[PDB]
Design a protein around this ligand. Structure first.
Ligand SMILES: [Zn+2]
Ligand SMILES: [Zn+2]
Ligand SMILES: [Zn+2]
Ligand SMILES: [Zn+2]
Length: 51
């Protein structure tokens, strides 16, 4: 699934990147720890507002 990285995650992604990752890794690690959010239209809008 496509995510937006909020923080660098070594080996996986860098803050600001939008990219595809394994679903289990997004669900159980990235989302759980606030390291990325789902790359939905709503989230991109909200994120751009908060930047
Ligand atoms: Zn999926
Ligand atoms: Zn940082
Ligand atoms: Zn970095
Ligand atoms: Zn946010």
């Amino acid at each position: 699934m496509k995510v937006i990285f909020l923080k660098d995650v070594k080996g996986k992604g860098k803050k600001g990147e939008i990219k595809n990752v394994a679903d289990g890794y997004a669900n159980n690690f990235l989302f759980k720890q606030g390291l990325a959010i789902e790359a939905t239209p709503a989230n991109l809008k909200a994120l751009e507002a908060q930047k």
